[PDB]
Amino acid sequence: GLSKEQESIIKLAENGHNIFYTGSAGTGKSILLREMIKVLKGIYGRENVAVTASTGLAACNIGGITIHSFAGIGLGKGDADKLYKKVRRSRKHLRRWENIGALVVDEISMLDAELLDKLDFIARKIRKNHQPFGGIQLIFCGDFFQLPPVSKDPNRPTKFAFESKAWKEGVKMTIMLQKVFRQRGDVKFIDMLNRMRLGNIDDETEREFKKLSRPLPDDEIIPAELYSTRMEVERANNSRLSKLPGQVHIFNAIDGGALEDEELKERLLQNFLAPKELHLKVGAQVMMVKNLDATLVNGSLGKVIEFMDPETYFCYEALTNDPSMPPEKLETWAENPSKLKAAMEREQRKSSVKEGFAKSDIGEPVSPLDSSVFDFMKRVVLENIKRKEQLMQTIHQNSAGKRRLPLVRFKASDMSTRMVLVEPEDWAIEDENEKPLVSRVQLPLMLAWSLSIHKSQGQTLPKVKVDLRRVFEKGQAYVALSRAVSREGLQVLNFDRTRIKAHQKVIDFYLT
DNA sequence: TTTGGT
Numbered sequence: 001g002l003s004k005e006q007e008s009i010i011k012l013a014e015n016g017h018n019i020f021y022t023g024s025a026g027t028g029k030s031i032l033l034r035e036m037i038k039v040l041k042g043i044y045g046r047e048n049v050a051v052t053a054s055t056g057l058a059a060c061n062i063g064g065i066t067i068h069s070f071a072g073i074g075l076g077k078g079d080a081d082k083l084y085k086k087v088r089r090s091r092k093h094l095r096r097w098e099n100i101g102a103l104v105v106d107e108i109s110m111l112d113a114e115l116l117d118k119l120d121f122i123a124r125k126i127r128k129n130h131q132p133f134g135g136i137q138l139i140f141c142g143d144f145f146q147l148p149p150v151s152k153d154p155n156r157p158t159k160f161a162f163e164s165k166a167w168k169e170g171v172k173m174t175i176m177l178q179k180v181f182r183q184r185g186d187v188k189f190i191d192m193l194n195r196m197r198l199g200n201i202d203d204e205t206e207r208e209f210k211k212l213s214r215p216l217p218d219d220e221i222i223p224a225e226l227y228s229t230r231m232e233v234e235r236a237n238n239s240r241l242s243k244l245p246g247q248v249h250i251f252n253a254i255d256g257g258a259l260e261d262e263e264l265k266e267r268l269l270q271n272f273l274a275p276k277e278l279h280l281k282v283g284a285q286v287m288m289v290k291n292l293d294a295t296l297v298n299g300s301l302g303k304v305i306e307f308m309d310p311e312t313y314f315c316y317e318a319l320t321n322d323p324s325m326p327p328e329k330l331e332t333w334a335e336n337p338s339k340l341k342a343a344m345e346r347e348q349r350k351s352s353v354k355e356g357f358a359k360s361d362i363g364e365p366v367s368p369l370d371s372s373v374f375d376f377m378k379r380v381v382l383e384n385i386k387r388k389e390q391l392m393q394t395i396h397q398n399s400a401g402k403r404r405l406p407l408v409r410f411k412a413s414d415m416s417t418r419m420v421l422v423e424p425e426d427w428a429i430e431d432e433n434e435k436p437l438v439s440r441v442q443l444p445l446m447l448a449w450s451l452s453i454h455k456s457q458g459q460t461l462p463k464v465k466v467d468l469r470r471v472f473e474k475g476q477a478y479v480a481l482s483r484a485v486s487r488e489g490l491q492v493l494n495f496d497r498t499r500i501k502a503h504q505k506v507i508d509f510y511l512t
Numbered sequence: 513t514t515t516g517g518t
């Protein structure tokens with residue numbers, strides 16, 4: 001049941017008119033966007049609405065890719081003129097600009113004007129036009145009192161989206177939803193959150209937020225944890241991995257390939273987001289960090305089911321697709337593993353580097369599969385003929401020396417679940433000659449119980465812990481505390497009335 | 513202290 005106000009903003013997009021809506025955290029913005037994305041596709045075709053957002057996880061909430069990933073601009077720190085020449089040299093991305101009828105963009109507060117103007121320049125010169133965006137309908141979404149775009153230099157403040165040429169050209173009104181939905185039970189809580197949107201903590205709200213520094217109820221509901229910087233996040237994801245039953249599976253990065261520099265080259269190789277050492281467990285929660293295909297993108301969340309190799313997986317897949325299979329078909333690949341590679345790879349320079357990656361030793365023992373992974377056959381009267389359960393296990397044991405890789409179940413935007421075997425991807429910073437300067441093979445997965453407050457923006461975390469220990473940018477404490485649905489579900493550490501203040505540029509916007 | 517690429 002969408003609200004009347006939420007429904008009208010959807011209709012309004014039938015105008016073709018650029019619309020920009022807003023309203024404090026958790027008002028239904030990104031939900032109604034989902035249905036407006038349905039009508040904009042029904043107007044220009046599925047393939048011609050660009051559904052993007054500022055951070056790849058926030059993109060998945062509305063079912064789409066990052067603004068950079070759609071645009072083809074990479075990081076887009078380059079010259080306005082430069083990016084355009086890069087986009088036009090990619091058929092996929094060129095004709096993507098040629099053909100789009102809408103650009104939906106959610107969590108706009110983290111878009112920086114400098115980039116919007118670059119995208120405007122690209123949208124025009126490619127679409128051969130001079131309208132606001134080469135005439136693309138803009139749907140803009142968010143709350144500017146939440147996180148601003150990331151200022152690397154904090155003595156060049158990064159010029160929020162509305163400071164741009166392109167915005168003043170194409171946004172000449174703001175709509176504003178006012179009813180709050182996320183916290184909708186805890187009314188005092190909402191008022192407490194609203195006076196945090198501005199920096200108006202009083203003597204009483206502080207005391208009431210400090211009452212929330214108690215411990216979350218301890219049950220099997222694993223709580224989400226939000227911290228300011230990536231260190232405390234990484235630390236709390238391990239503090240949860242250590243608490244999870246089972247051994248860790250260490251995945252060690254493969255690194256090359258230019259001559260001897262080490263003053264920053266490992267400052268370059270810690271600076272990859274691809275840890276030199278990635279630990280996982282069965283039942284862990286991971287998030288993809290590389291755009292890999294249409295529905296498996298940076299910001300997909302998943303839960304590791306067990307670890308397999310290709311061959312042990314090809315068999316496991318067979319059984320999920322025929323869950324009442326005759327047990328004979330298995331023993332043919334169980335006890336005749338020559339004919340398994342027969343049936344498997346009949347289905348169709350960097351290949352050797354990702355070969356030696358995740359290679360168990362020729363003799364290292366092989367922990368058997370979990371009995372969790374056979375619960376799908378566990379819907380019960382007469383004849384249990386899961387000898388098949390033991391059969392798979394024998395197949396798994398043959399992977400001694402083979403390449404064992406985490407089998408993840410991902411739950412997509414539309415809650416469509418999809419299981420993939422996560423091969424390693426590779427990262428590289430390359431020169432003008434593309435030379436092997438600095439390379440790293442690694443799994444494109446991160447643990448996802450904890451999130452930086454930035455990646456936390458967009459999500460609803462019913463049970464959540466918040467540690468405002470290092471909060472630095474304006475809005476950061478608002479975004480974090482505003483994730484929780486109830487005070488019951490919330491725990492807050494290190495409350496500091498003075499590290500909670502609002503950006504002046506934005507109050508100026510909301511009144512000039 | 514933070515995001516973003518294939």
Ligand SMILES: Nc1ncnc2c1ncn2[C@@H]1O[C@H](COP(=O)(O)OP(=O)(O)O)[C@@H](O)[C@H]1O
Binds near residue numbers: 001027029030032459
């Ligand atoms: N029409 C609605 N009625 C009831 N609850 C809603 C409605 N729309 C959204 N919600 C809930 O409120 C929360 C906020 O929705 P969302 O669109 O993410 O807010 P935000 O505006 O901050 O992006 C969501 O978790 C959603 O479950």
Ligand code: ALF
Binds near residue numbers: 142
């Ligand atoms: F803008 Al939001 F949760 F998507 F506050």
Ligand SMILES: [Mg+2]
Binds near residue numbers: 030031107458
């Ligand atoms: Mg939203």
